[PDB]
Design an enzyme around this catalytic site. Structure first.
Site, PDB file in Angstrom:
ATOM      1  N   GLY A   1       2.653   5.900   9.772  1.00 62.73           N
ATOM      2  CA  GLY A   1       4.074   5.828   9.446  1.00 62.73           C
ATOM      3  C   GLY A   1       4.737   4.552   9.941  1.00 62.73           C
ATOM      4  O   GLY A   1       5.842   4.234   9.506  1.00 62.73           O
TER       5      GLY A   1
ATOM      6  N   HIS B   1       0.815  -1.214   0.000  1.00 63.78           N
ATOM      7  CA  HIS B   1       0.000   0.000   0.000  1.00 63.78           C
ATOM      8  C   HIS B   1       0.869   1.295   0.000  1.00 63.78           C
ATOM      9  O   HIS B   1       0.324   2.392   0.109  1.00 63.78           O
ATOM     10  CB  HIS B   1      -1.087   0.013   1.086  1.00 63.78           C
TER      11      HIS B   1
ATOM     12  N   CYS C   1       3.773   1.422   9.368  1.00 61.26           N
ATOM     13  CA  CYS C   1       3.636   0.290   8.456  1.00 61.26           C
ATOM     14  C   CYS C   1       4.981  -0.146   7.906  1.00 61.26           C
ATOM     15  O   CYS C   1       5.844   0.687   7.665  1.00 61.26           O
ATOM     16  CB  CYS C   1       2.619   0.579   7.356  1.00 61.26           C
TER      17      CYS C   1
HETATM   18  O1  LIG Z   1      -4.614   1.191   9.085  1.00 63.16           O
HETATM   19  C1  LIG Z   1      -4.284   2.372   9.036  1.00 63.16           C
HETATM   20  N1  LIG Z   1      -5.174   3.396   9.078  1.00 63.16           N
HETATM   21  C2  LIG Z   1      -6.583   3.273   8.982  1.00 63.16           C
HETATM   22  C3  LIG Z   1      -7.383   2.963  10.084  1.00 63.16           C
HETATM   23  C4  LIG Z   1      -8.709   2.607   9.893  1.00 63.16           C
HETATM   24  C5  LIG Z   1      -9.243   2.552   8.621  1.00 63.16           C
HETATM   25  C6  LIG Z   1      -8.469   2.884   7.519  1.00 63.16           C
HETATM   26  C7  LIG Z   1      -7.140   3.277   7.696  1.00 63.16           C
HETATM   27  N2  LIG Z   1      -6.272   3.533   6.598  1.00 63.16           N
HETATM   28  S1  LIG Z   1      -6.286   3.079   5.034  1.00 63.16           S
HETATM   29  O2  LIG Z   1      -7.648   2.857   4.654  1.00 63.16           O
HETATM   30  O3  LIG Z   1      -5.491   4.021   4.304  1.00 63.16           O
HETATM   31  C8  LIG Z   1      -5.454   1.529   5.013  1.00 63.16           C
HETATM   32  C9  LIG Z   1      -6.190   0.359   4.922  1.00 63.16           C
HETATM   33  C10 LIG Z   1      -5.536  -0.861   4.932  1.00 63.16           C
HETATM   34  C11 LIG Z   1      -4.168  -0.865   5.033  1.00 63.16           C
HETATM   35  F1  LIG Z   1      -3.523  -2.060   5.008  1.00 63.16           F
HETATM   36  C12 LIG Z   1      -3.420   0.277   5.144  1.00 63.16           C
HETATM   37  C13 LIG Z   1      -4.075   1.496   5.135  1.00 63.16           C
HETATM   38  C14 LIG Z   1      -2.816   2.731   8.787  1.00 63.16           C
HETATM   39  O4  LIG Z   1      -2.645   4.095   8.404  1.00 63.16           O
HETATM   40  C15 LIG Z   1      -2.221   2.528  10.171  1.00 63.16           C
HETATM   41  C16 LIG Z   1      -2.310   3.518  11.143  1.00 63.16           C
HETATM   42  C17 LIG Z   1      -1.891   3.265  12.437  1.00 63.16           C
HETATM   43  C18 LIG Z   1      -1.383   2.013  12.723  1.00 63.16           C
HETATM   44  N3  LIG Z   1      -1.262   1.042  11.809  1.00 63.16           N
HETATM   45  C19 LIG Z   1      -1.668   1.316  10.563  1.00 63.16           C
HETATM   46 CL   LIG Z   2      -1.673   5.121   2.288  1.00 61.10          CL
END
Ligand SMILES: O=C(Nc1ccccc1NS(=O)(=O)c1ccc(F)cc1)[C@@H](O)c1cccnc1
Ligand SMILES: [Cl-]
Ligand SMILES: O=C(Nc1ccccc1NS(=O)(=O)c1ccc(F)cc1)[C@@H](O)c1cccnc1
Ligand SMILES: [Cl-]
Lengths: 304, 304
Positions: B143, B41, B145
């Site tokens: 950040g 992603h 990930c």
């Molecule tokens: O999952 C996250 N945020 C989030 C929370 C809840 C729903 C959506 C998102 N972000 S998203 O739809 O852009 C996404 C979805 C799937 C994925 F694998 C990566 C990003 C990611 O920014 C994150 C933050 C904090 C700790 N771990 C991960």
């Molecule tokens: Cl993203």
């Protein structure tokens, strides 16, 4: 989101861990520049520990009696001295892995990471707090002495603790890197007991702020209180007295959440007086006090 | 003595953390040999995350669009590919700090250390368990990930987890190092919820053994039980069913303490049915399940 007892990355400290042997006693040493720091009870046998006169015991020892090993290589000891409860072994080679470091004597209530070691090899890393009674609740076995406690400020390691002993009560005593014990403990096989283990009130409050930041706000009530009234309750529950300095230090957390410190204090007061009623805060069924306000801010902002 | 949620020394993994940028998205990558592994992603914007067709999205990207930075030095990307939910960036330089490593897909109930990172820089290390519902209860911010989970066997790092997402419920989902998610989670900005979070019964038992080893035996009773009877109680309290394999794995702990597994099960049954009555076990007011029988044995024997 999420809140964990998070230790500092331990790599800079792993690069400093050596094995120190004197006679049949083997413990850990910290190699920084051309000096190896280790507990002075390395020169004692279990027989000597009853009443050790370390100056006399050190005199029957020479440079060649201190075996220092960094990994599989043997270090040459060219000097030795006793600074309080630590021996400083001057070696002929500077540690190529010496990071930017400082020796700091931390205050009770402050937290640090411990790299538990055996035979100069690291086995684990965990987060700790220096209790108000100057003990630590660690995980240390025979051979762990010389394991250090530290903090990291970007690239500078502040060594704050060296492990020396476990008290009969299962808690741990040790020194700063200048050999001075935290608390009234002495490096002798004698009846030593820790004082009352009070709760670090400012840390419990910082952790209530972390809980709120992380979506857990069931404990938040419609009440407030005063420093004097809150402290009347804290005194009874063996909690550290909360000062205006503590309120000030909680300022950044109070600002980010929009919850006044005295409002958080009233919630804490009801948690003390009524208990958690089977509920949890940050997956914990008790009030956590091993996170300073700095630890909460760092964890909730990603300080690397 | 003492029992802590102890993470592995993180130095070998710190040496592998790099920063990967693609467009305006910056996350962490793992540099082992001439390959950088990171979540796929990285090629998405928050707009793409609603419904990303990663094959089409990857096609609009070339080698020069992936910026890899190891500390302050820029790595040259000579190849790129998508393996399940991870991108593998072939760089022209092998990591001089690559340790002996393996990629392993762990089982639910097993534990591992996480080196939480931001911009390719490590910020902390903590111990985790892969929940029976394939989520982890970590501490991860924006950040983070690409932060990895690992185990260490003397000098070999078994990479088991890569952080990808936080679910709306605050728990964490990610993949193994081959890009396969643990559980039913997909890397899409969509309503995803975890299943029931059951308790790892074998781990709670191993931790009761650690408590006994460490002098805490108030919970030990005069009763015994059977696997079927204990499991009737475990089922009601959303505890994982205990098998004969679990009893066998608890054998080394049962032997060292002289307490039969079914005797420990009866104590657990009374702790479930009656609660802790305000008491603590290993300083905890709830039943800890994030220590496997291997973790207890290692901690109580000093495995470096
Ligand atoms: O999952 C996250 N945020 C989030 C929370 C809840 C729903 C959506 C998102 N972000 S998203 O739809 O852009 C996404 C979805 C799937 C994925 F694998 C990566 C990003 C990611 O920014 C994150 C933050 C904090 C700790 N771990 C991960
Ligand atoms: Cl993203
Ligand atoms: O304190 C320990 N054991 C112990 C426990 C209780 C009483 C005495 C001893 N050991 S002793 O009298 O030889 C001693 C005394 C003071 C000292 F600074 C070092 C050693 C020490 O072996 C140890 C083990 C486990 C984790 N930390 C330290
Ligand atoms: Cl000794």
């Amino acid at each position: 989101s999420g809140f964990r007892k998070m230790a500092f990355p331990s790599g800079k400290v792993e690069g400093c861990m050596v094995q120190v042997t004197c006679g049949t006693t083997t413990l850990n040493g910290l190699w920084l520049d051309d000096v190896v720091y280790c507990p002075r009870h390395v020169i004692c046998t279990s027989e000597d520990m009853l009443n050790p006169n370390y100056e006399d015991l050190l005199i029957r020892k020479s440079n060649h009696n201190f075996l220092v090993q960094a990994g599989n290589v043997q270090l040459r000891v060219i000097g030795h001295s006793m600074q309080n409860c630590v021996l400083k072994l001057k070696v002929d080679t500077a540690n190529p892995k010496t990071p930017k470091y400082k020796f700091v004597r931390i205050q009770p209530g402050q937290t640090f990471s411990v790299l538990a070691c055996y035979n100069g090899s690291p086995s684990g890393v965990y987060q700790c707090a220096m209790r108000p009674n100057f003990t630590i609740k660690g995980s240390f076995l025979n051979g762990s002495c010389g394991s250090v406690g530290f903090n990291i400020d970007y690239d500078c390691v502040s060594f704050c603790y060296m492990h020396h002993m476990e008290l009969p009560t299962g808690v741990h005593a040790g020194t700063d890197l200048e050999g001075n014990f935290y608390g009234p403990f002495v490096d002798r096989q004698t009846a030593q007991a820790a004082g009352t283990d009070t709760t670090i009130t400012v840390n419990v409050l910082a952790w209530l702020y972390a809980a709120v930041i992380n979506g857990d706000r069931w404990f938040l009530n419609r009440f407030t209180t005063t420093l004097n009234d809150f402290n009347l309750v804290a005194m009874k529950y063996n909690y550290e007295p909360l000062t205006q300095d503590h309120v000030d230090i909680l300022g950044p957390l109070s600002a980010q959440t929009g919850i006044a410190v005295l409002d958080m204090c009233a919630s804490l007061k009801e948690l003390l007086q009524n208990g958690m009623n089977g509920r949890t805060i940050l997956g914990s069924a008790l009030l956590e006090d091993e996170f300073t306000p700095f630890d909460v801010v760092r964890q909730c902002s990603g300080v690397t």
